Amino acid sequence: GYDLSASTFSPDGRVFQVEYAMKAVENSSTAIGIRCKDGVVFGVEKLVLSKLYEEGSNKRLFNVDRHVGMAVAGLLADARSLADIAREEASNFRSNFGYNIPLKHLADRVAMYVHAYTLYSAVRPFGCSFMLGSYSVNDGAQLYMIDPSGVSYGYWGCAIGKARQAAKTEIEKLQMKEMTCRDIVKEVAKIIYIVHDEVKDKAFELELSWVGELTNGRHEIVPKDIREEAEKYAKESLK
Amino acid sequence: MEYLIGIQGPDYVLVASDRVAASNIVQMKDDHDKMFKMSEKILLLCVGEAGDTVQFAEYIQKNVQLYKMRNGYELSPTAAANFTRRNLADCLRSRTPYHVNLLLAGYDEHEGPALYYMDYLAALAKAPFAAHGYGAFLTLSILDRYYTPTISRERAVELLRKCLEELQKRFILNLPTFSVRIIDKNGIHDLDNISF
Amino acid sequence: RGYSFSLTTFSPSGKLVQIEYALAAVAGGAPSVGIKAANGVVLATEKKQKSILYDERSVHKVEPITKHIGLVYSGMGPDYRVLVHRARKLAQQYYLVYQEPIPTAQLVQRVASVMQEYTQSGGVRPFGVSLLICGWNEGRPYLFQSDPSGAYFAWKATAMGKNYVNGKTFLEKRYNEDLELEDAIHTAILTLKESFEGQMTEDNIEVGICNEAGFRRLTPTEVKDYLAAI
Amino acid sequence: SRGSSAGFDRHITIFSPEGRLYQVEYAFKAINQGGLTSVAVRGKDCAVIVTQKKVPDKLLDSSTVTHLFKITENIGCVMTGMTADSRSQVQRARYEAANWKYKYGYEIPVDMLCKRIADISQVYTQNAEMRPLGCCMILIGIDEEQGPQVYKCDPAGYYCGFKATAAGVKQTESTSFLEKKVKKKFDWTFEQTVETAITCLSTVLSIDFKPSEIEVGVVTVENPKFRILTEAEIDAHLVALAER
Amino acid sequence: SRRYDSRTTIFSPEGRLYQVEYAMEAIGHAGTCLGILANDGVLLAAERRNIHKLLDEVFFSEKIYKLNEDMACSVAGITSDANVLTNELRLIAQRYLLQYQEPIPCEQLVTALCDIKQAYTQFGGKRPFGVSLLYIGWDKHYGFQLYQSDPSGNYGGWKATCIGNNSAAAVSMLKQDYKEGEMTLKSALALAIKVLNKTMDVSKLSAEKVEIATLTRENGKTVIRVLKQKEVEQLIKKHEEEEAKAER
Amino acid sequence: DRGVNTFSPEGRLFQVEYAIEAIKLGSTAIGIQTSEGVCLAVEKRITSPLMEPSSIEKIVEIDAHIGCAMSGLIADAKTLIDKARVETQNHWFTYNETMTVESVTQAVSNLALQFGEEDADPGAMSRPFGVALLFGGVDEKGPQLFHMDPSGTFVQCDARAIGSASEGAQSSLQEVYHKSMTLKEAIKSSLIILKQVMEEKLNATNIELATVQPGQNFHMFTKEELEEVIKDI
Amino acid sequence: NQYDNDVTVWSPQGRIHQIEYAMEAVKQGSATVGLKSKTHAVLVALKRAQSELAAHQKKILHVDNHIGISIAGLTADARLLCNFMRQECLDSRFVFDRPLPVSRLVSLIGSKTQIPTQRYGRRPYGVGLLIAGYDDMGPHIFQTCPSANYFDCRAMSIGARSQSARTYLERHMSEFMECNLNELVKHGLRALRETLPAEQDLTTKNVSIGIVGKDLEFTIYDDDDVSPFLEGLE
Amino acid sequence: SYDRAITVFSPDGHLFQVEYAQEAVKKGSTAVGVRGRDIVVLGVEKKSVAKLQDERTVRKICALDDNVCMAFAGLTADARIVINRARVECQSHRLTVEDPVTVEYITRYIASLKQRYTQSNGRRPFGISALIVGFDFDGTPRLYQTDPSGTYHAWKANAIGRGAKSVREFLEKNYTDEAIETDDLTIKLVIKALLEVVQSGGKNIELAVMRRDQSLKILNPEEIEKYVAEIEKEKEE
Ligand SMILES: [Cl-]
Ligand SMILES: [Cl-]
Ligand SMILES: [Cl-]
Ligand SMILES: [Cl-]
Ligand SMILES: [Cl-]
Ligand SMILES: [Cl-]
Ligand SMILES: [Cl-]
Ligand SMILES: [Cl-]
Ligand SMILES: [Cl-]
Ligand SMILES: [Cl-]
């Protein structure tokens, strides 16, 4: 059988172990990113598997540098490992070159690390996909997504996890190029509520973060009051 | 300051060494033995820096004995002398040099008696007679004067004594007793200590 | 990580099958010929070259190792480049120590030893190449073959790659010891023509010569000259 | 023989009974998984690379979707096949070129760079613990003595210089198109190099391109620095072609 | 990786080492190689496998290797493997000369190589070397000597032996004809030819198809020589004359 | 065939489970803890009258205040026993005090699960130890008996049997054990139980017995002392 | 079958069977409960005794003055991880002269335990922990898993029949924040008691208790010391 | 370096590589040891005879040091490795302790070497058992046996290799105070024990003795035939 090692091609030229890692991501609940006029907004449908957990357990949004957020889907221990790799890459870049890592370079560097786990019987591919978002006056808003194969591209809008397609269909309806982060957070909440399957998974938390002109290029959690209004807007829009 | 001497006759090698272990202004042992049996027909006599002397000689001894166990026969005196030299030379420029001066005395069935001199630098010379220590400065000329290649063992023990009496007379250090051994076809024989 | 176990092992009948299969890669390679003349050696090979699109001069199958030694192969090109590089390095290592160009036989022995390693060392397959190595030293020409096992052989003349059995019998009929280099080049090309298919040009074969002046590739114009008679 | 197999010869890079390396063969199939084709052509004055630019998803930042890469100021490349593998190989090429210049004091020749990458790929065909990269690299640059160069290397570690070449899904059809065309030309040499590249790609795909559906990179004897054409520049070529 | 490891250094259920046994089958198919000890010397005689007409003849032998001043060997089995081992023998021998300033006794050289062979059967997961060797030598402890070693890392001393193709038949002929304590180099040579004549059942024995080397002592020095073709043709002649005399 | 660090679907390491089965091939050993000290007793399991029974040592001194009884693959126990001896002496060296029975047992138990084949030194441990151990001794907590198996799990026991007839022997230990039992009663009980479970007829040469008491150091019973205890049983 | 022996082998469903199997080691451990108020974090554990004459396995371990753990699964893996936690705590006091924040220590566990899940020939840790701590952000109960995931908990139970204990905890969790210590420990014990067969009860032999809080360094209560907590239960 | 786990447990607690190593020992030539009062004797069945063999080069009885020797059964190449390891260790002991080894010390060393090769990555067990004999510094005679597992014990007498079972049976019945009261009888016991199994009425038997302080003496064919005739004419009555 041709699907047991990332160092074996199948006869059609596939690397099934990478495809299987992708299936782990596609089983996870949905995360979205949207780039807009003045920043990037992330949102995650964070399924609550027990009411015994604290609100805030198993965050899927991370700060990887002061100007860079990361949003994940897939196997969470793998994702946290990658957040640490991203952090180290950003820190090393600052020490060596003396300025904040450009988002595109950070994405490319972490993608190459992910890629290195797709060649060998000695290790397995990461079971996660993640988005990286930043804003600066010089570089504007940037949103990248990296998958288990190590491919990295830039996006206006992106979604990862099980309702990815349904989410992309909703993101496509927005003229995000002309909208502000404050407008977009509502829309992010709205879209998470639309694609959530309330019959098949009972309870979720909305996790929101942003980076933009309004945060002075710092990646931050969306303030509690704004998140709560965004949820109320999303719920009422579901009508 | 330690003294070693060897004298090779036609079918034997005679060796002697002082029996003193000194430290600072005191003799701390007066029956010390500076000879190491390597095999049935080989003695290594070793002097020099404390620690280095016993560590080096006992390493050589164990390896000579190992060769016998592995192979069922002994190294020749010449092979043993070259093995010793290789080790000392190999350590000369290492982190663990051995500051030792040696004589190796032996009898080989086919080659007869042999006496080898080695200094701490690991230069190896075969000689009809030789001596190490400050006492060599006072005794080598006595050996040059009276030796012959065919010197009998009774006469060789006299010649040895003249060297040792010369140390009593003229050398500033108190070396009152000496170990004496002879090697021949029949192995290693202990003789009486020569004592003053 | 590196696998530390051998990928070549003995079968119950005493065969090293990975080596036999490496030999099958060589047998399916493009033909190569070597002929030791009285005063030199010729190495000749066919290019497995489709397309007018290839820049035939961009990569060479006939390659210098030193001023006085050259080689060609049959089998897998990329494996060959490994061995060329190693041969060149071995030849320089020798020169640095001895300050004399490496004797052909010494270079062969060292390259063959590398090939042997790849039949036993951990986590690798043998080379899918046989080499023909020519040289001139001690006032005399040498032609050797080195195979995927690391075995080597001195030849007066031989063929390797596709249709090598018939090439060797063609050479057995045609070789004599007194033969000169120019005549030998001619017979080497005729030996390629035996199994060619599709009209010979100076662009789809390569020829190297070795004599007292040294090893060199023949130029396209020189090869065109020899091709006019064939 | 004829497709025989023993032991693990379809899983790792050991020889099959015919002397094949199935894992290497499968790496060539991996090149086609991405569904793209690239073409490269050289003339006396320039060398060009053209590839398809597919952006199916409207939410992609299309400025980040490229298969063209600068290796040095004077060496460009088009990658075909698995994307992350390709990016890795581009990074390695960048490193090898930079290291060459540091150690030797002159820019790496295109042939030498292509050879180095091909030699690195060779290792993956002989060592069992890693797979080959499922990608194909085409390099362009100007050599001071030989003029414009096009080189290609593959997952088997083969490499060659070309008058023109292709890679990916329609490689064979592109090769036939380019063969047929050069035979007509005096001194078997391409002259309208950017138009030949685009026409070849359009013919074998049956498309008729918009300027946002292809990318073009060039090096020239007068301007050796690798340059990527804008959309407007690509459009001036598409319109000039359309009118004959 | 555990899937791909063929586990070359493990026991089989009967306490066997299969790679060693299989390597022994490879040797059994290689060229016949015999060694005979005499009172005044020791010889090796080997079937040549390099016999194609277009081969060039550049070295002094095909399968006989000088190891040091006082020793030589021949090999049966995988040639490239033999080249690795013979190079190692030469190194061991020079390490011993450097250390002791006398030549390595013959049995000590054999033992040292056999410890390397043994290791390849016990650890490291590599295939063993597919070689058996015959060693001829003189030393000051046991004079003229003949050893055999095989891929298990076992060895033994012999008056006369054979490895490679048709060994079993060659050893029978040796058991019957060898005169313990009474062989000369002249008679050992005659016997070597007799044996090769019967065990090369691939055709009428010829000088081009065999190699013979002798090891003797002359004036306190060891002499190792590969017989020239002229000499070998003469020995084959004298054997064919003797078989004619044999009836009546 | 699978790796040595593979979990079964039940959440156990196959190699450890298999090592635990090897303990059942061992001869029976018994430990009992009393307020007056601990006794350790073991069946020698002699296989030929030509074997010297004194060369079977299945009870060993760890230090003057600690003994150890073993069952299973005895050769495996050597590196464990040596580690216990060395640790107690390291502790004495550093702290100038005797190491507790619990601490010695803990130190040895940290070697269990240190096996595996890609991570560690060139020839590190390939498999777990096929041994169970009873550590019996006296420290400031008083007399103590600890049990350890190849999982690296260790626990204090009032009485415990290990080895082939440990079921059986453990049932009899439940029956006879009580907290106020004297050492002499515990010694008698463990020999009565060994006598039941042993295939051979118990005598003064085919068993070993040792004690540790607050009074006195580790003591292996001599033949004559065994003969004396064996009279009543 | 072919996907279940190596932690490096993804299955076609996007699962890693070796990780799932390692989690079974925790489900078969004896139950333990952790819960917190605004001022204290408590651990309660059922100890198994192999036989009637064995002591009962330790379940609760000291990590630092402000942190302790309860374990379920392979004991030797628990000790290895506990030793790692101890060392990380010591390092933090050595370097910074302050206690390691509990959430940062749990992050370190997640990172350490993820590594062997991704490398050939390594295995997951076969242990689950409940972690009780107190720092500047108050009391904490965290849960760690063989998957290397971890959870910040209002309360939790892991091990055999822990679903029962979890149901009790959900039922009463709105009370926990405002409970005095005595009440909080009682809740822990009641939850743990839900895991027991109908006949059996909590005793001084089978219950272990760990407590840390605002005014109380991490302290373990066993044997006669659990008696105060067991009286005035029911 | 090669780090595969070679010796592992199987279901029911088996170590198959060690069991297979033991099978290798069982196919080896029979070896016997008896411990006498002031003598210890080793005897071993030869290989296959072979008239053209140099006998000296295949002995299966080996000196480890002046006061200790051993015989083995199983893989002869493995034995050589174990022997030369033990020879090195005897010299380390003399170096650091300034006494010769006890037979027990060197046995324990050899046994732990063997145990280590059943529990270390990349290696298979040694396919040999050894009978180790000699005298302790205080004159006490000793006979120990080691096997591939690393287990060792002391014996009054024992056999290893092919037919060890029946040779042990014979020894159990024949090892008395009477049968070891003298040097000759101890030696004649060993020969009798071998002649139980030894195919060509030996002939193919190697034998060696060690006396208190006296070092390994091997017996020549002439000396063995004298014991053989002396035993055979006694078994006529
Ligand atoms: Cl996704
Ligand atoms: Cl490996
Ligand atoms: Cl090169
Ligand atoms: Cl040169
Ligand atoms: Cl050239
Ligand atoms: Cl530079
Ligand atoms: Cl054109
Ligand atoms: Cl030499
Ligand atoms: Cl030499
Ligand atoms: Cl048990």
Ligand SMILES: [Cl-]
């Ligand atoms: Cl548990």
Ligand SMILES: [Cl-]
């Ligand atoms: Cl456990």
Ligand SMILES: [Cl-]
């Ligand atoms: Cl989890």
Ligand SMILES: [Cl-]
């Ligand atoms: Cl659970």
Ligand SMILES: [Cl-]
């Ligand atoms: Cl070892």
Ligand SMILES: [Cl-]
């Ligand atoms: Cl046996």
Ligand SMILES: [K+]
């Ligand atoms: K590969």
Ligand SMILES: [Mg+2]
């Ligand atoms: Mg010093």
